[model samples]
Target: ARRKEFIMAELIQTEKAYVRDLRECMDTYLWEMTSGVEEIPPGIVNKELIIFGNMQEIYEFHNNIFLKELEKYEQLPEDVGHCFVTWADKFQMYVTYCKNKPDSTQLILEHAGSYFDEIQQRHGLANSISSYLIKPVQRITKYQLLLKELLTCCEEGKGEIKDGLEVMLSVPKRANDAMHLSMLEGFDENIESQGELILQESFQVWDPKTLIRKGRERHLFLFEMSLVFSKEVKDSSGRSKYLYKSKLFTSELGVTEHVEGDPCKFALWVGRTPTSDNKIVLKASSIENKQDWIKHIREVIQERT
Candidate 1:
């Protein structure tokens, strides 16, 4: 009985601490970088929006609204799950924050040394800018865990807590997908605008004309509007990146699920021709993987046609 009260109290206490971290990040690092201070470099100052995303919105909601709502239920801790259900929609902002995270890390790494170090020293902060940047990502995942704790305690409102927990679970998955999409490089056009990344996997691609003894390894990305093939290579700095190889627009796409003798093989073709350039055969690691790709690709094709 009292254990439930402790859990509720821990939620409110941690929320306050998390809010303080957000305020410190906004006031110290974000402000110093954006305030036209001569000490900070122009490279960092120019990309503040990318680094911060919609953190101000997240901070405002928690600090001014959600925290207050939670405090009101301190006396009746059993009903705290209702506040989560009511505020679940506001959690979407975390997706934008998490999506920008990879870029933020890259930018920070590019400008870390003297410029950021000096800022940290001047502000008397305990953690680095990158440390603060990750808090929101960590915080969004924490809500799901804390709600699960609440769910175990409350027998009556288990449904609402479970509902809120379900929504919170999806936030991290969507955010993770966006983060992976952001890391892909060497596309002239915006990859994010290609619509949701439906499926991505490494496949053994066979050259249609060669019918070689072995297949070349290629990474395939299936987007709502396009399907792309890429070769994975390491950059000069030893970072792995994907180089574009070829693409098939959904408008002109065709798929063949069965490749005669091979259970894991499938074929994709563009236009009306079966020529080498227009057709490629792919072998997935497993039959199940092949089927999943076929199903998603077929769904996209059906929607387009």
Candidate 2:
């Protein structure tokens, strides 16, 4: 019971931070951008007003539900796990944001690049506006961690503990689906530093150091800043989740394509340190995929340099 109480307290804590981010999106960032156009002053409204409105709805939902239950999580441990599970579907509003994804991709990009600079100079929040926009969508996966903690605290065959585990299982699927759609539409975490995914595809990867013949199939995400390889892993219940294997910054990345091979192989030569030799040999299923990967990677590197 004490263990469950601690986990529930953590959920309330993180949920509070989540609500603050949503409110900040409205009061600080959104309002400042498109204010006074409708006699509303210099800090209210946006071209993507629908998003602003949905953010409020999400914010209020968390504030009301979690704050109302915060005391319960502290005082009564028995129902807290079920309560956490109950709020699982409330996050469906994220799907609403995805469905109504704005036409402000370039506008948001511009704001991330230029407008936020002035905001920062003026002693405003230092992060990009895009980071504020995707806070709710990115938050779903965090519950899994808290709930896994709660599960360890409970006894076997406890219904509410199992329920929390089930919710944990469901959240990653929803979070993954939302993030992929967000990335496809140019909305993801960290705009300025990590760069954006310009292109993504699946390929078979080999480790020359290991001489592994049957390489693992992995998803290659080409960002303006780096190249990442990830593959899906199945949970004990056979649900899928993606795990990042490795990444290489474009800063010192080297690429070499073995044109002599009929399979048309390429390597993402990365992390060349005096102490360690690291490289990822990739085999594309077709010549076209190989060329496309090489072309986009070179484009990113050229832009980086």
Candidate 3:
């Protein structure tokens, strides 16, 4: 008898199975429009602003405006959806509060000591500012942790939601640097641009490998994770469909910048396909001086992705 030969196809083990499962989880659906706006789903931490509770406040206030804009037409377009996420990020920190309710409360009162000797005596403020400063940051930390947990849960080999995933954890919300650009709603069987949409002030700027490397203890990962973009679409059946599948690797453009309140420039960025670097360089002083860069941008906007 000869020993059997095997390849990757025959591999079977708990760890391998876990890895396979994880890969599948990583491939979650993206949620956005061509405008690059997406809903504030769980498992994602919004960075544009400091979120607290104002998320609900702004949502209630502008959601009507946002919906009405969509209603004028029968369907919603890309950019309009993008603005909601953009607007939500601003001022979210103000409403932020952390889960460190027990530990944090103790540190403020016990740690710091008062100082008043015969050298100098002056009137101090009555209120304790330590708690004020630490409280918001603690809450913000919770918000971020909650977001990471949400994202982690969506990954492959991790665990599933206790029940179905219908219930999502709430994150802090606010309105800081948010601005509306466009909105859309149409029933013409094709997309109709709506109101003005805003741009992302920043991207996730994350790496999965690095995270795994740092979190070696496996002590506190609420969930495994994957990140992606989102879009709106329709199948041949003429149904409203959401697609979360847009992602840009560094090899394509090599660089990405998220500029808020600036359309012409953001258009210039996501618009151009950088065959070569230096096509778009960011420098405060020399930005306007580069002719080749500008020419490349002009060409890109006229004919970009």
Candidate 4:
């Protein structure tokens, strides 16, 4: 269909533009900073490594490798999905890129007005370094959106295309989870030691005894080994921050679905009963979100037990 063709064309076109942006960011800022010429002050010399974080690798892959592969399938746009499936593992590089994003943004904020801004002006770059640093994050999510549009136009029964879309979807999800984990504050223990972050979301929490009152907002992070509860608070700068609240080991966790006949509500507690001393009822933003949480929580509980 013509619709599918345009979507494919858009994907290729946007990918090219993204590659150019990455190159510009590297040449204009990243490479210059790392060239050891003291373009930036000594305080932020090696910090470019944190600021850029595998961007050169990402740029090379797209500029030299993936772009060529994508162009190869230009005549047969439907086959583009196969390219994604083939290079799926390579895409995990975006996870590292995304996880470092918070740090990158922080570093830019710390030095942007003092040093990086001067460098930006001297180079005649239109945007600050942070603007370009976010390309990888934006691009990864763009792939998901573009692929979803492409999938909509493709004829049904093309499982490979669906598989490709699935691949793209998970990459962004992981990137997103990694970004959130990196932004987490006041939790001193290394989160990676627990396991990969499976799911995280905001829930309205209520003590079982006080179901008659308003529920409190809590952000819940579910990992392989533990389920963490946190309070989402905004700092003086108006940015969102997650404050560490409490956690329950997956091995000792219990979940009760369809609590009190409310489709949006669930109960979690330590040990086997909903009546446990630590029991807290959670109301998800929607029934579907609640189901997702329950499904993953059940999967983790089964694996742990």
Task: Work out the TM-score per prediction.
Answer: 0.66, 0.48, 0.19, 0.76
Clashing pairs in 2: 31-43, 31-44, 36-41
Model 4, span 1-305: residue lDDT tens? 78878877888899899898998888878777767364565556678788889999999899889999989887787778899899998988988787777777877776644676777887788978778887888887788887788778887647368788788788768878876766678887878878989898999998654547568998888999998888889979999988998778999988889677678999888875656447888999999999999999999999988
Candidates sorted by lDDT, best first: 4, 1, 2, 3
lDDT of each: 0.80, 0.64, 0.27, 0.82
Best by lDDT: 4
Where does candidate 3 have its weakest 10-residue lDDT segment? 218-227
Candidate 2 residue-wise lDDT, 1-305, digit = tens: 77776776777777788887787777766666555232322222345564343777778887787667656666655556677567767756655654444534544454345554455456567556667766665665566666567667767656475686566565454434446424332224454566755566777777655554557877766777977666766779996555666667887677777735556688776655422246667888889989988888888777877
- Model 3 lDDT vs. the true structure? 0.27
Where does candidate 4 stray beyond 4 Å?
13-17, 36-39, 63-65, 102-106, 113-131, 166-176, 183-188, 207-215, 233-241, 269-279
Candidate 1, RMSD to the unseen true structure: 5.2
What is the lDDT, from 0 to 100, of the residue 15 in candidate 4?
A: 86
Q: Which lDDT value does model 4 have at 158?
A: 70
Better candidate number, 2 or 3, judged by lDDT: 2
